[PDB]
Design a protein around this ligand. Sequence first.
Ligand SMILES: [Cl-]
Lengths: 104, 104, 104
Amino acid sequence: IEEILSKIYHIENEIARIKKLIDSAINNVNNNVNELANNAVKYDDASKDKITLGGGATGTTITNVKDGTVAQGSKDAVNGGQLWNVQQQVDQNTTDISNIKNDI
Amino acid sequence: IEEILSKIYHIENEIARIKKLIDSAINNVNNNVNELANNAVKYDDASKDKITLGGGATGTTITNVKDGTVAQGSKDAVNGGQLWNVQQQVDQNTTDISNIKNDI
Amino acid sequence: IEEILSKIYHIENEIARIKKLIDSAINNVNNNVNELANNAVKYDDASKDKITLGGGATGTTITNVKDGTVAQGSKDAVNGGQLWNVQQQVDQNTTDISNIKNDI
Ligand SMILES: [Cl-]
C-alpha cells in the first residue's frame, strides 16, 4: 500500500513534468512561427497573382537582384544597373540629336 | 483505499485533460504553419539563386516596389514609373529624329 | 488491490504513449517550420522597407514576373521583356542618328 502511494506520487510528478514539457515545446514552436509570420514576404491571396510589398505607403526596395535576361518576352526582373545602361544610351542619343539640330 | 481510488480517478481525468491540450495546441500551431506555407514567397532551392514566382503561367505582379537606385552596377529592382520616365525620353528622341528627317 | 495495481500499470502505459505523441507531434511541426524558415523570402527587418535577396554575392534572379504597368509613378516591378522593348526602340534611334550623320 505504501508502495501504491509512492507509485501514485511519482505518477503525479511525471504528469507535472509532462505539462511543463508541453508548455515549453509549444511556446518554442509558436515563437519560431511568429517570427517567420512577421518577416516572410507573402502573396496577397491564394491566386498568387500579386505581391503587394509590406513596406507601407513609401514602398519596399528589393535589392541583390541578379541581372535578368533582356530578351523578347523575358519574365525576369531587371535591376537599376540594367536601367542605367539603357539610360546612358538614351542620354547619348538625346545629346547627339541636340548637337545635330544646333548644327544648322 | 477509497482515497487511492479517488486519487486514481483524478489522475485519469488529468491525463484526459492533457490529451485534449496536446490536440488543441498542436492543431493551432499546424494551422498557423499551414497558412504561412501556403502564402510565403519562396526560393526555388537551397542555393537561393532564383525565385520563380508562384502565380502560374501568366505570372505574378510585384507592386509597392520603391524606386531602385539607377546607377552603374545597381542590384536594386526598378519599377514601372522608372521605366515610364525612360520611355518618355525615348519617345521624344524618336519624334525628334522623325522631325529632323521629314525636314528635308 | 490487484485492480489498483492493474489500473496503475495502464496509467503508466498511457503516460508513455503521451510522451511518444508529444515527441512525434513536436518533431513534425518543427520540421515543417524549419523547412519554411529556410526557403521563405524575408524582409530584412520589421520596417519592411527592404528585401536583400538571399542568393549571396552574385544575387538572386526573380522570374515569372508579370509585366508591370508602365505609367507615371507606377510601383509595379518590370521585367526583361519590357526592358527589351525599350532597348529595341533605343537601338533604332541610335542607328537612325548614325545614318543621318553619315549622310553628310
Ligand atoms: Cl533613345
